[PDB]
């Protein structure tokens, strides 16, 4: 059967803005929170209005007094020398570096972020940071503050939206995804020096002109995060519940980020 | 297939804005022309920049002095009574009608229009017509003239963007797609007077408020569009050429609409 037929079959009644709003409150999402969100649309079961419903639901709970952030990574703009998903012929690499269109926050699609993110990032009043590989989008009270001045180097480091979320004592919401999607733990890797440094590259508009721009980042390794997540959960203070069929987690970003930092040093 | 490794192996060298631009000019696309575009991204072969490269290429060739149109249909808003892809239990139908978010031109995503349209839809200075099921988006000189005052009933009829393209002696561009994707033939169906009406439903904003609205339209049938296409290419004028691996067709909209109108009449 098609993906969609299975999704419908595993749903007893439709998910709606209203039932999603209800499930989010039940889990503990509150007006005025700062929350970074990671999601799988399909994991919820069938939704009337798909991604738009999920976005509107989150907004209705958090409100404009709170802030929603999602990662909007665009790794298709990276140096093809290092591509594996899929690799392309070596003879294409320079053509790509010379022709791939420059990052533009209002235009460039995301890769591997999900339909909720694609909806969110083009939604009215949502704002996006200027990083060409590792940007975030945000909506609400601290949206501009969170996304402004993202350093080109160390995209998940002390000068990124993650650090701004940390200073706001924000929350992480995982909807139907595990710890390997939990971007905030990249901040633990930065602070522990857990992973090696790499020269990266991306196309940007600089002084009006298109430049292939190089910089330093960390070779972030998500495979760790599942391990870290299981140990973090034993310590307590991860709230768990369902949004439709989606296994969801809600936690404080400071808590997991501080635990992650110790996990890598010990 | 649609697997990325297969799309890379289908391609000798990458497609770029520059190569796509050149292919479009070779086919007959010109500065200042009015053109409605239908596309498959995968059909072209691997593109550096994907959908962004295709939109930039089109805009480069046509320029602000021309007009680009694309269908931005949103059939996930239709009455679930008739869904087949997939169908949903009858018990969900009234809940769907009570809960599916209303059409909002800056928010409502498209369904089955393709990645090129989803990219295009969100560009700056792109304007979208007002129809919850059969909207269009446009950019350039005639973008407002074409998209304004679309009627709710007979969505592809005499008060639709299709008739405005017809009046402007515009062109239809198919990229790696067939005549079942040729929306303009709907205007033929309306005009023939030969086809049968149906009651349809969708959620709109009326009085600044969400309502499920019912209206009349044609039971547009794209299998007759395909029959019309085969005959038209035997009889009428159509330019064929390639964009990467994509077989493409460029034709005058007035020519196929007039032919189809006769075809439906017999
Ligand atoms: C550690 C790091 O920094 S990594 C970067 C962080 N990453 C993230 O935050 C991403 C988290 N999300 C994930 O990891 C997810 O597993 C994803 C997005 C990669 C894939 O999950 P999916 O549920 O398959 O995809 P997505 O969430 O885009 O939903 C699309 C699917 O929903 C389904 N769907 C479509 N409409 C509906 C609907 N109305 N209701 C329910 N499901 C629907 C379809 O099957 C669709 O699949 P298709 O695009 O193949 O047609
Ligand atoms: C009756 C009426 O009026 S119909 C309304 C009018 N309809 C239309 O205009 C629709 C016309 N288009 C079609 O019919 C097409 O056949 C479609 C859109 C239905 C499907 O075409 P596809 O090429 O499969 O999809 P689309 O154009 O969205 O491109 C996405 C695909 O491009 C491919 N792709 C992704 N990145 C790249 C890249 N850089 N380079 C090349 N291809 C890529 C992937 O295979 C992707 O598939 P996935 O999402 O399954 O991974
Ligand atoms: N093709 C790819 C694009 C981006 N990253 C990869 O690993 N592969
Ligand atoms: N789920 C569906 C949406 C729109 N049309 C269909 O046939 N099916
Ligand atoms: Mg531009
Ligand atoms: Mg817009």
How many whole angstroms separate alpha carbon A53 and alpha carbon A45? 13
How does DSSP assign B15-68, residue by residue? Answer: B-HHHHHHHHHHHT--TT-EEEEEE-HHHH--BTTHHHHHHHHHHHHH-TTSEE
> Is A47 among the annotated ligand-binding positions?
yes
3-state secondary structure of B144: helix
Resolution, rounded to a tenth of an Å?
A: 2.0
Instruction: List B36's β-bridge partners, or say none.
Output: B69, B172
Q: What single-letter DSSP state applies at residue B255?
A: H
CB B70 within 8 A of CB B137: yes
For B142, B173, B253, B259, the CA distances from B230, given in Å and listed in that order, are 31, 16, 16, 12
Experimental technique of record: X-ray
Beta-carbon contacts of B142 under 8 Å, excluding residues fewer than 6 positions away, are B34, B67, B164, B168
For A114, A222, B79, B127, B194, the CA distances from A213, given in Å and listed in that order, are 27, 25, 49, 33, 60
What is chain B's length?
A: 266
How many whole angstroms separate alpha carbon A105 and alpha carbon A131? 8
CB B139 within 8 A of CB B66: no
CB B168 within 8 A of CB B188: no
CB B139 within 8 A of CB B72: no
How many CB atoms lie under 10 A from the CB of residue A208?
Answer: 5
How many whole angstroms separate alpha carbon A174 and alpha carbon A185? 13
Q: Is B110 in the pocket of ligand 2 (CB under 6 A)?
A: no
Q: Is A85 in the pocket of ligand 3 (CB under 6 A)?
A: yes
3-state secondary structure chain A: CCHHHHHHHCCCCCECHHHHHHHHHHHCCCCCCEEEEEECCHHHCCECCHHHHHHHHHHHHHCCCCEEEEECCCHHHCCHHHCCCCCCCHHHHHHHHHHCCCCCCCCCCCCCCCHHHHHHHCCCCCEECCCCCCCEEEEECCHHHHHCCCCCCCCCCCCCHHHHHHHCCCEEEEECCCHHHCCCHHHHHHHHCCCCEEEEEEEEEECCEEEEEEEEEECCCCHHHHHHHHHHHHCCCCEEEEECCEEEEEEEHHHHHHHHHHHHHC
CB B260 within 8 A of CB B228: yes
Prior bond of B7 cis (ω within 30°): no
How many whole angstroms separate alpha carbon A215 and alpha carbon B215? 56
Biggest distance spanned by C-alpha atoms of chain B? 55
How many whole angstroms separate alpha carbon B87 and alpha carbon B95? 14
Q: Does A57 touch chain B (CB under 8 A)?
A: no
Beta-carbon contacts of A161 under 8 Å, excluding residues fewer than 6 positions away, are A69, A129, A136, A138, A146, A147, A150
Residue of B18, B51, B91 with shortest CB distance to A99: B18
Smallest CA-to-CA distance from A166 within A253, A61, A261, A38 is with A253
Residues of A whose CB is below 8 A from B46: 88
Q: Does B5 touch chain A (CB under 8 A)?
A: yes
> Is B235 among the annotated ligand-binding positions?
no
Q: Is A40 in the pocket of ligand 1 (CB under 6 A)?
A: yes
> Is A141 among the annotated ligand-binding positions?
no
What is chain A's length?
A: 266
How many CB atoms lie under 10 A from the CB of residue B188?
Answer: 26
Residue B224's H or E segment, with its range, is helix B222-235
Label the pairing between strands A127-128 and A209-218.
unpaired
| Geometric angle at alpha carbon A190, from A204 and A201, rounded to 5° | 20
Residue B204's H or E segment, with its range, is strand B197-206
For A259, B33, B55, B95, B215, the CA distances from B252, given in Å and listed in that order, are 65, 11, 21, 44, 31
Residue of A4, A48, A85 with shortest CB distance to B96: A48
CB A192 within 8 A of CB A261: yes
Which chain B residue's Cα is nearest to A88?
B8
C-alpha neighbours within 13 Å on the C-beta side of residue A221: 14
Interface contact A86-B119, CB threshold 8 A? no
How many whole angstroms separate alpha carbon A26 and alpha carbon A241? 8
Smallest CA-to-CA distance from A115 within A191, A176, A198 is with A176
Residue B70's H or E segment, with its range, is strand B67-71
Q: What single-letter DSSP state applies at residue B103?
A: P
3-state secondary structure of B242: strand
CB A227 within 8 A of CB A188: no
CB A148 within 8 A of CB A231: no
Instruction: List B200's β-bridge partners, or say none.
Output: B215
Interface contact B92-A13, CB threshold 8 A? yes
Label the pairing between strands B171-175 and B246-252.
antiparallel
Query: For the sheet containing B34-39, what is the strand order?
Result: B126-128, B136-140, B67-71, B34-39, B171-175, B246-252, B239-243
Residue of B86, B91, B108 with shortest CB distance to A8: B86
Q: How far is B160 from chain A (nearest CA, A)?
A: 25
How many whole angstroms separate alpha carbon B36 and alpha carbon B71? 8
Q: Is A83 in the pocket of ligand 3 (CB under 6 A)?
A: yes
CB B265 within 8 A of CB B194: yes
Q: Is A89 in the pocket of ligand 3 (CB under 6 A)?
A: no
How many whole angstroms separate alpha carbon B225 and alpha carbon B100? 30
Interface contact A52-B122, CB threshold 8 A? no
């Amino acid at each position: 059967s098609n993906a969609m037929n299975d999704i419908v079959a595993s749903t007893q009644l439709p998910n709606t803005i209203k039932t999603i709003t209800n499930d989010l409150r039940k889990l503990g999402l509150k007006k005025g929170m700062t929350v970074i969100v990671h999601s799988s649309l399909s994991s919820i079961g069938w939704i009337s209005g798909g991604a738009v419903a999920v976005v509107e639901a989150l907004m209705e709970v958090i409100t404009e007094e709170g802030t929603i952030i999602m990662p909007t990574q665009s790794s298709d703009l990276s140096d093809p020398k290092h591509w594996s998903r899929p690799p392309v012929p070596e003879e294409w690499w320079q053509i790509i570096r010379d022709n791939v269109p420059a990052f533009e926050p209002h235009i460039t699609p995301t890769r591997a972020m999900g339909k909720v993110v694609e909806c969110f990032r083009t939604y009215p009043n949502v704002v996006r940071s200027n990083h060409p590989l590792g940007s975030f989008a945000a909506w609400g009270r601290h949206a501009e503050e969170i996304t402004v001045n993202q350093s080109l180097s160390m995209s998940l480091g002390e000068e990124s939206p993650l650090r701004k979320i940390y200073d706001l004592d924000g929350y992480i919401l995982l909807i139907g995804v595990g710890y390997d999607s939990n971007t905030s733990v990249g901040l633990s890797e930065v602070r522990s020096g857990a992973c090696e440094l790499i020269k990266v590259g991306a196309p940007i508009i600089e002084n009006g002109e298109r430049v292939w721009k190089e910089f330093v980042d960390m070779d972030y390794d998500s495979d760790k995060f599942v391990e870290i997540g299981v140990e973090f959960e034993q310590k307590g203070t991860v709230t768990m519940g369902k949004i439709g069929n989606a296994k969801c987690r809600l936690m404080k970003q400071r808590d997991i980020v501080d635990f992650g930092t110790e996990w890598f040093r010990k």
